[PDB]
């Protein structure tokens, strides 16, 4: 009794969430993330996930669009890219959801697991949860950084 996240609709997910930690390797430092946007969670057809949130990197706004097809294996999700790897877990808390995606950059692995709920208004509980998911990543010590909830990209000069 197990699971991971996809009985028969990832128990409703669609809705704009945000991210609340997000855990960097030490490898590849430069680009920092300095805020963060609402995540916006689409589901297609309960079959597809599209996932577009813009994230404040080093001052520039990214705008990024991931899609998480479903494969035959429950639980696990891919891009296009086939490098890819993404996978959706529901946090111990509620309103909360771990996610996390492998594959490699120019020649390198790289990953990343990023929390992400805050109806609560954050949850020390859920981010045990995710600290747990990093760790068990071995991820709980990289530079692990909580983006404050910017509802819109915008240094934030007023």
């Not at 086939?82 to 959706?88: D, P, R, T």
């Not at 509620?94 to 996390?100: E, L, P, R, S």
């Not at 990023?114 to 949850?123: A, H, Q, T």
Request: glycine residues 8%; contains cysteine; negative net charge.
């Amino acid at each position: 009794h197990h699971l991971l996240a996809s009985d028969e609709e990832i128990q409703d997910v669609s809705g704009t969430w945000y991210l609340k930690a997000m855990t960097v390797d030490r490898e590849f430092p430069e680009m920092n993330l300095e805020s963060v946007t609402p995540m916006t969670l689409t589901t297609l057809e309960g079959g597809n996930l599209e996932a577009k949130v813009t994230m404040l990197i080093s001052g520039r706004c990214q705008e990024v669009k991931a899609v998480l097809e479903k494969t035959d294996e429950p639980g696990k999700y891919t891009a296009d890219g086939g490098k890819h790897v993404a996978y959706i877990i529901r946090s111990h808390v509620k309103d909360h959801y771990i996610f996390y995606s492998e594959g490699e950059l120019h020649g390198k692995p790289v990953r990343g697991v990023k929390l992400v709920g805050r109806d609560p208004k954050n949850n020390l509980e859920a981010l045990e949860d995710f600290e747990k998911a990093a760790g068990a990543r071995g991820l709980s010590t990289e530079s692990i950084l909580i983006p404050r909830q910017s509802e819109t990209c915008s240094p934030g000069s007023d």
